């Protein structure tokens with residue numbers, strides 16, 4: 494488990510933001526879904 498965020502988890506034009514223990518993606522203004530899918 495080395496760097497889960499390789500190319501942004503979100504399946505959109507979102508932004509990545511994770512570390513050795515955390516994991517959070519910056520979805521879009523009004524976008525539902527764990528990885529911007531809705």
Ligand SMILES: *[C@@H]1O[C@@H](C)[C@@H](O)[C@@H](O)[C@@H]1O
Nearest residue numbers: 506507508509519520521
């Ligand atoms: C990271 O956040 C997302 C939501 C977008 O605004 C990107 O342009 C930015 O780099």
